[model samples]
Target: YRQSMNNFQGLRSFGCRFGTCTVQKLAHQIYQFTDKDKDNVAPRSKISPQGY
Candidate 1:
């Protein structure tokens, strides 16, 4: 659980470092709840499978 939370926070941080506000916003919106491990990488509940 901690690792998952870390991943979420890390992605958000990466988005913030994008410099451009538009890109940052887009990244934020896209990666906010994305489960990259899941085949579809879609948001699912509070807990979601990580995307590949």
Candidate 2:
């Protein structure tokens, strides 16, 4: 299916095949993913330590 990258907002951008905006977006996502509770490192019972 053909998908319009823009929300039908008319020509905007797509020229910088690789750019800072993309880097910033991905970095923010990575930061959030890494910002989890350090105490509960493991989620699964088998993976977690005893008394965890």
Candidate 3:
């Protein structure tokens, strides 16, 4: 997970450096989470497929 976090941070840094995207709450959710965020729901909890 180290490298994963590293890449995620790097992306944010680059985005900021190039004025690509500002650091905000919604930006964080859509960018970082995108279509693979699984927090409130479990992988196989039979509740939600994509935390939606």
Candidate 4:
């Protein structure tokens, strides 16, 4: 992942065409931080507030 890339850049690097592929990487990382299973796996959250 590019540390220089902001959310926008990351989003741009991986477009919506990529769908979850774009955010999956970062999302997984986030899961690492908040993973309650302690298995470094992420829990699924409802996508109510979709982003641009």
Best model number under TM-score: 4
Give the alpha carbon lDDT tens digit for every residue of 1-52 in model 3.
Answer: 1334444544444445235455553354453446465556433564464533
Q: Candidate 2, after superposition: displacement of residue 41 in Å?
A: 22
- Flag regions of model 4 displaced more than 4 Å: 1-21, 37-52
Mind giving the per-residue lDDT tens digits that candidate 2 earns over 22-42? 555444434444765444433
Model 3 misses residue 16 by how many Å?
13
Taken over the whole model, the C-alpha lDDT of each candidate is 0.51, 0.46, 0.46, 0.51
- Clash pairs for candidate 2: none
Model 2 scores what on Cα lDDT? 0.46
Model 3 residue 44 distance off true place after TM-score fit, in angstroms: 18
Q: After superposition, how far is residue 46 of candidate 2 from its true place, in Å?
A: 35
Could you tell me how far off, in angstroms, the CA of residue 1 lies in candidate 2 after the best superposition?
A: 22
Clash statistics: count for each candidate = 7, 0, 0, 0
The candidate 4 region of ten consecutive residues with least summed lDDT is 40-49
Of candidates 2 and 1, the better by TM-score: 2
What TM-scores do the predictions have?
Answer: 0.22, 0.26, 0.19, 0.29
Model 1, range 1-52, lDDT digits (tens) per residue? 4344344534545434456555655555565556344445444555566653
